[PDB]
Design an enzyme around this catalytic site. Structure first.
Site, PDB file in Angstrom:
ATOM      1  N   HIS A   9       0.748  -1.177   0.119  1.00 26.54           N
ATOM      2  CA  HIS A   9      -0.104  -0.041  -0.034  1.00 26.54           C
ATOM      3  C   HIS A   9       0.993   1.250  -0.027  1.00 26.54           C
ATOM      4  CE1 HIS A   9      -4.141  -1.724   1.461  1.00 26.54           C
ATOM      5  NE2 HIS A   9      -3.416  -2.654   0.764  1.00 26.54           N
TER       6      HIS A   9
ATOM      7  N   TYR B  21      -9.205   4.832   7.724  1.00 25.07           N
ATOM      8  CA  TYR B  21      -9.264   5.166   9.465  1.00 25.07           C
ATOM      9  C   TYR B  21     -10.595   6.013   9.291  1.00 25.07           C
ATOM     10  CZ  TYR B  21      -4.887   2.918  10.236  1.00 25.07           C
ATOM     11  OH  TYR B  21      -3.855   2.215  10.565  1.00 25.07           O
TER      12      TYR B  21
ATOM     13  N   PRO C 193      -3.701  -0.660  18.889  1.00 24.22           N
ATOM     14  CA  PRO C 193      -3.694  -0.924  17.612  1.00 24.22           C
ATOM     15  C   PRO C 193      -3.689   0.047  16.567  1.00 24.22           C
ATOM     16  CG  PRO C 193      -5.573  -1.872  18.445  1.00 24.22           C
ATOM     17  CD  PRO C 193      -4.948  -1.452  19.663  1.00 24.22           C
TER      18      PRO C 193
ATOM     19  N   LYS D 108       1.461  -0.645  15.065  1.00 20.73           N
ATOM     20  CA  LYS D 108       2.622  -0.924  15.758  1.00 20.73           C
ATOM     21  C   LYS D 108       3.296  -1.919  16.570  1.00 20.73           C
ATOM     22  CE  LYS D 108       3.917   1.515  13.392  1.00 20.73           C
ATOM     23  NZ  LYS D 108       4.617   2.576  12.701  1.00 20.73           N
TER      24      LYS D 108
ATOM     25  N   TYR E   9       3.983   6.412  10.079  1.00 22.06           N
ATOM     26  CA  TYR E   9       3.212   5.458   9.731  1.00 22.06           C
ATOM     27  C   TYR E   9       3.972   4.269   9.057  1.00 22.06           C
ATOM     28  CZ  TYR E   9      -1.051   2.712   8.752  1.00 22.06           C
ATOM     29  OH  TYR E   9      -1.923   1.831   8.680  1.00 22.06           O
TER      30      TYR E   9
END
Ligand SMILES: Cc1cc2nc3c(=O)[nH]c(=O)nc-3n(C[C@H](O)[C@H](O)[C@H](O)COP(=O)(O)OP(=O)(O)OC[C@H]3O[C@@H](n4cnc5c(N)ncnc54)[C@H](O)[C@@H]3O)c2cc1C
Ligand SMILES: Cc1cc2nc3c(=O)[nH]c(=O)nc-3n(C[C@H](O)[C@H](O)[C@H](O)COP(=O)(O)OP(=O)(O)OC[C@H]3O[C@@H](n4cnc5c(N)ncnc54)[C@H](O)[C@@H]3O)c2cc1C
Ligand SMILES: O=C(O)c1ccc(O)cc1O
Ligand SMILES: O=C(O)c1ccc(O)cc1O
Ligand SMILES: [Br-]
Ligand SMILES: [Br-]
Ligand SMILES: [Br-]
Ligand SMILES: [Br-]
EC number: 1.14.13.2
Lengths: 394, 394
Positions: free
Chosen positions: A72, A201, A293, A297, A385
């Protein structure tokens, strides 16, 4: 019974560490409390950082991942009706993340371990650690009733949050940091095409929602849920109706729903212990720390602890540099605290908290508006990220 | 008595607005509750953004500032023994901030107003606002006992936090956001050379400390202090000893101390009201919002509200575009919420909070380590510190 490195726990940490060690010529034995099937039934993480993807390749366990994993280049964040995309690749200087389920990684490693013939003892009952500060620590356990002893030079506690290893270090030598969030995630795995090619998200007034995936035909969705909820209180239908209620309409319209393959509730938590070692015992992964979550990580931190422990054990065995092992905690903790901070930040801006005053709500919204509209803000999200760089030691 | 724009309050907001308006040919009268000397005795802000520096030039009141103001290209942040410099100029794309006291700006404007002969009524007692929703609102006040009426088209409430204008809008039309911090700043002005050529913000275990300046021979220092402290409880000597205790030793060693010219305690607060107008009344500056001083945004936000109101009044008077005035609040609020967020962030990472658990302390430290060591993190601080861009309207 004797080995060089004893490993407690056969989840991602233990297997990865064990595989790395084996390929380098360092004998290692893994003790697992459960059966292989039980471990294989856990549906958890799905996002892997570049660093973890390279460690899998180094362990020679990357064929299936290179085939089935999805690379991604961005993630989306939806708040107040709009969807904002973070171009990870452009913003991080070309890094990406790879979506490949934790169950898959575990399966690839278990297979690799079997083929090479290294020792793995499942159903190792009542594991106990002894002589942690001596020159020769040992482990005792029960295999179908009889107590067996395993001698080793070092012990790697890769037994997760509820493992025996962290509990084996005198509580006065440890410093615990912890925050418990007033909510959990209700996750759902379905054999339906994901709603988007990338992850979404979502901050919605009813609570957080996350649209994720496992393959082109398998999806994973989560919705924030309070601690009082019971999984039996959420039928498949109740879940889809709630998920849809939390997503922007153009996303909800194209959602392909379906019966759940797995459904569970995971509570959110932050937890760190310092140091991460005691004598000849070294903690790795969930045994040493927990992150909510929201930033994906957890499994990624487990990989970096393992990457660090492995290289330090190599120096020790191959180079006789046994003193470098004292640096494990300092090295690991630097990366851990930054990941903990990223996870905390993500969590606080995407979730709805119970007793929030008007000011905090406006600030939360403004955090998103600033970070999602500023090139410098977007870069802070992006470099964190994809994963901050692994420290190289020495 | 009659004018075009009535202005309540002669602090920076009112004077700046009035000066801008006057230069463009729009009559305006200012009503101030205090005497000129009282207003001139307030020691407050010292940091000005680029946008504010340009508005001063536009108002033709920049000669003294261009001479005496100090242009700063960076600010330092000290935490855990180390000092980290943020290169504002390099990180923001070349913007800088200018240190020039608020008292000076006020003095420059008051002088400019006097010379041009515009109307200013000091000791305007019991100011009252009437007919806010009519076509002809008016103001009544008392000058040495007799009640006088002032007719106008519009009223600009530039009377600060405790002014009468915000109190004149029906409470049901307003939405208030507020957070009170459990500490204040004890500030001290001295006629001594500043300890550094640039500002130093300091996070220390005993509390926050700030080393600022007014000129090459005048300094201003602040130390975080709890709400229970009384200024009479802090002798000059107690202050210097505490300041020194909170700074890194190489900084404390070269500190030139001296008797205070002014000393006071200002409590920290966040406050925003929406909308910022009602009929023909428009709020500006502290009358509409408060930010903790940690980000130096207060006087700067006042300037942007004023910059916006002025341009909207121009369109209205010169172009007959009276309808654009409805956009005032939307325009202002965008910049205000981002400044409020920056101020809040700065405040939470540099100050020591009373009941903080171990986790939060570690996160606070990690916030600093991340933002001060990441190029993208440093840029978030820098672009916010120099000041986000003014929206141009239309
Ligand atoms: C229930 C749960 C749900 C999660 N859900 C998510 C999620 O949705 N998303 C996400 O991003 N991350 C999630 N995480 C985190 C992520 O999965 C982990 O960080 C990752 O599994 C860590 O790997 P590990 O090897 O350190 O721990 P684990 O995977 O927990 O493996 C530790 C292993 O040691 C074994 N063990 C325990 N005690 C003993 C003992 N006494 N003797 C011998 N062996 C022992 C256990 O049976 C287990 O196999 C979740 C974690 C948990 C606990
Ligand atoms: C006590 C205090 C300390 C501060 N300290 C700092 C600091 O250290 N650092 C910093 O960065 N910022 C500080 N600030 C903020 C910064 O100084 C302001 O944001 C700035 O002064 C705003 O200008 P203004 O014109 O909006 O308000 P003000 O400067 O408050 O001016 C408003 C004026 O209106 C007048 N007025 C009030 N009521 C009436 C009435 N009923 N009728 C007529 N006139 C009236 C007042 O006398 C006053 O002159 C402080 C603010 C205050 C209140
Ligand atoms: O399971 C996922 O796919 C997943 C994806 C992103 C994230 O932050 C957390 C998750 O558990
Ligand atoms: O008074 C200052 O000089 C000053 C400087 C920086 C800041 O953030 C706040 C302040 O009041
Ligand atoms: Br999985
Ligand atoms: Br995680
Ligand atoms: Br001043
Ligand atoms: Br301020």
């Amino acid at each position: 019974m004797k080995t060089q490195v004893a490993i407690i726990g056969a989840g991602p940490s233990g297997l990865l560490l064990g595989q790395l060690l084996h390929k380098a010529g360092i004998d290692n034995v893994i003790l697992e409390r459960q059966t292989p099937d039980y471990v294989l039934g856990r549906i958890r993480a799905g996002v892997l950082e570049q660093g973890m993807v390279d460690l899998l390749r180094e362990a020679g366990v990357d064929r299936r991942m290179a085939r089935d994993g999805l690379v991604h280049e961005g993630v989306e964040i939806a708040f107040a009706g709009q969807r904002r995309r973070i171009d990870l690749k452009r913003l991080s200087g070309g890094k990406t993340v790879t979506v490949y389920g934790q169950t898959e990684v575990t399966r690839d490693l278990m297979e690799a371990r079997e083929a090479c013939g290294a020792t793995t003892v499942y159903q190792a009952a009542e594991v106990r650690l002894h002589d942690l500060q001596g020159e020769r620590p040992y482990v005792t356990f029960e295999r179908d009733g009889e107590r067996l002893r395993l001698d080793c030079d070092y012990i790697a506690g890769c037994d997760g949050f509820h493992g025996i290893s962290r509990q084996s270090i005198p509580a006065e030598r440890l410093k615990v940091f912890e925050r418990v969030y007033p909510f959990g995630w209700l996750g759902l795995l379905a054999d339906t095409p994901p709603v988007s090619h990338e992850l979404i998200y979502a901050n919605h007034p009813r609570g957080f929602a996350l649209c994720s995936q496992r393959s082109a035909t398998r999806s994973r969705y989560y919705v924030q849920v309070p601690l009082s909820e019971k999984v039996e209180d959420w039928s498949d239908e109740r879940f889809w109706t709630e998920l849809k209620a939390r997503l922007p309409s153009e996303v909800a319209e194209k959602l392909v729903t379906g019966p759940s393959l797995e459904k569970s509730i995971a509570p959110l938590r932050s937890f760190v212990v310092e140091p991460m070692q005691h004598g000849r015992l070294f903690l790795a992964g969930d045994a040493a720390h927990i992150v909510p979550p929201t930033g994906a990580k957890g499994l990624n931190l487990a990989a970096s602890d393992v990457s660090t422990l492995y290289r330090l054990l190599l120096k020790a065995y191959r180079e006789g540099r046994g003193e470098l092992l004292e640096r494990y905690s300092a090295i690991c903790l630097r990366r851990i605290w930054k990941a903990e901070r990223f996870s905390w930040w993500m969590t606080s801006v995407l979730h709805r908290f119970p007793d929030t005053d008007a000011f905090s709500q406006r600030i939360q919204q403004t955090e998103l508006e600033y970070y999602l509209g500023s090139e410098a803000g977007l870069a802070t999200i992006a470099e964190n990220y994809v994963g901050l760089p692994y420290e190289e030691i020495e």
